[PDB]
Design a protein around this ligand. Structure first.
Ligand SMILES: Nc1ncnc2c1ncn2[C@@H]1O[C@H](COP(=O)(O)OP(=O)(O)NP(=O)(O)O)[C@@H](O)[C@H]1O
Ligand SMILES: Nc1ncnc2c1ncn2[C@@H]1O[C@H](COP(=O)(O)OP(=O)(O)NP(=O)(O)O)[C@@H](O)[C@H]1O
Ligand SMILES: Nc1ncnc2c1ncn2[C@@H]1O[C@H](COP(=O)(O)OS(=O)(=O)O)[C@@H](O)[C@H]1O
Ligand SMILES: Nc1ncnc2c1ncn2[C@@H]1O[C@H](COP(=O)(O)OS(=O)(=O)O)[C@@H](O)[C@H]1O
Ligand SMILES: [Mg+2]
Ligand SMILES: [Mg+2]
Lengths: 173, 173
């Protein structure tokens, strides 16, 4: 009766939202009920003035964790796509969420700067925003997440299949 | 597939949490699945240093609304027990939640002051806290909520019965 949470962490431009949306389309095509919690989407719904200092990011992460916890424990698959740049926060999330599936889209900096349709890295290079996660903002890489995908070497389709494969191995699907 | 939210609004000491807990107990004995969102509980879990200015309460209310909306659209009865002192915020909640059941525990200030086991009215009356909702902090009373109960004239049992009666007339149970 307890479902699972796919927690996709990574720096800006790693491909988190893309993978989250592809997974949603696939799982709902199979007849599953799914909720998407995207960092940018949740911020602009709930607190669009919230900034990106550490305490602010932490409060926002705590909100997303509790949202996933409540949905998951009631049978609802939840897909989270938030930067979540610190190891300690993802360990907190793993403790709050029983069936926790950490997904890390790994992508080199030089590719991430060329995969920036919103222009965050461009703004950052011009000093217009500071501490962008992935450039001058720190990102603590996961050591052994349930799934690592190299978004510079895999297609979105292969990323989806790799997550689904691990989900079946866990017995969650 | 769409469930409902019982939104219990009122000033401090009105009896919101007591009624929320009695409803939780009653509905789960009927074999229902229920999530409880209490203002004090959510605050100490998600942001215990959040204060009580209008903008701070408004953020917290938006968080609660989003959690209730996500749970209820997946078939999960949600019981909210938060002060929610302004009509504008409860109207926002009503727009965000299809099956919205507003419940107002109405209770005179004189009774509320004698029903203060946490001692908030005492702390307020000695200037220790400012703007306690129900004393000097404002509360906009609901005009035509789905259920009004007078907690100075009705037992908790009778409050539960009244809510359940309204839920069956709406077709929600
Ligand atoms: N496997 C992939 N292969 C090639 N391009 C990709 C891949 N995944 C994403 N892209 C593109 O990379 C861009 C950024 O992807 P996106 O899902 O927005 O990353 P993000 O991690 O959510 N960024 P942010 O929300 O700012 O933290 C988009 O143009 C995607 O279409
Ligand atoms: N129908 C009732 N009749 C008599 N006493 C009651 C009734 N309901 C609650 N009480 C008591 O009134 C006190 C306050 O009730 P409570 O549920 O904590 O109110 P509240 O609105 O949640 N306060 P707050 O969380 O600070 O905004 C408690 O001691 C209850 O036991
Ligand atoms: N210093 C920053 N300033 C502005 N935006 C940032 C910054 N760092 C990351 N971002 C982007 O802001 C969007 C929302 O990020 P989140 O996932 O919500 O980050 S998090 O650290 O709080 O978890 C994302 O597109 C993110 O890449
Ligand atoms: N000025 C205040 N200062 C401290 N506590 C308050 C104040 N006003 C109300 N409270 C109490 O703080 C607890 C949590 O309140 P909430 O339900 O979360 O209020 S709300 O306005 O933000 O919706 C409740 O016990 C509430 O009665
Ligand atoms: Mg994104
Ligand atoms: Mg209470």
């Amino acid at each position: 009766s307890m479902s699972f949470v796919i927690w996709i962490t990574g720096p800006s431009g790693a491909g988190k939202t893309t993978l989250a949306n592809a997974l949603y389309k696939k799982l709902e095509s199979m007849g599953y009920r799914v909720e998407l919690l995207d960092g940018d989407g949740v911020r602009r719904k709930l607190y669009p003035n919230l900034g990106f200092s550490e305490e602010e990011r932490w409060m926002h992460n705590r909100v997303v964790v509790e949202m996933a916890r409540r949905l998951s424990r009631n049978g609802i698959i939840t897909i989270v796509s938030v930067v979540s740049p610190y190891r300690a926060w993802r360990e907190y999330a793993r403790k709050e969420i029983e069936k926790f599936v950490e997904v890390y889209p790994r992508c080199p900096l030089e590719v991430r700067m060329k995969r920036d349709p919103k222009g965050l890295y461009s703004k950052a290079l011009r000093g217009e925003i500071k501490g962008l996660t992935g450039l001058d903002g720190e990102y603590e890489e996961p050591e052994n997440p349930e799934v690592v995908v190299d978004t510079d070497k895999m297609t979105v389709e292969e990323e989806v299949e790799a997550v689904l494969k691990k989900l079946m191995e866990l017995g969650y699907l």
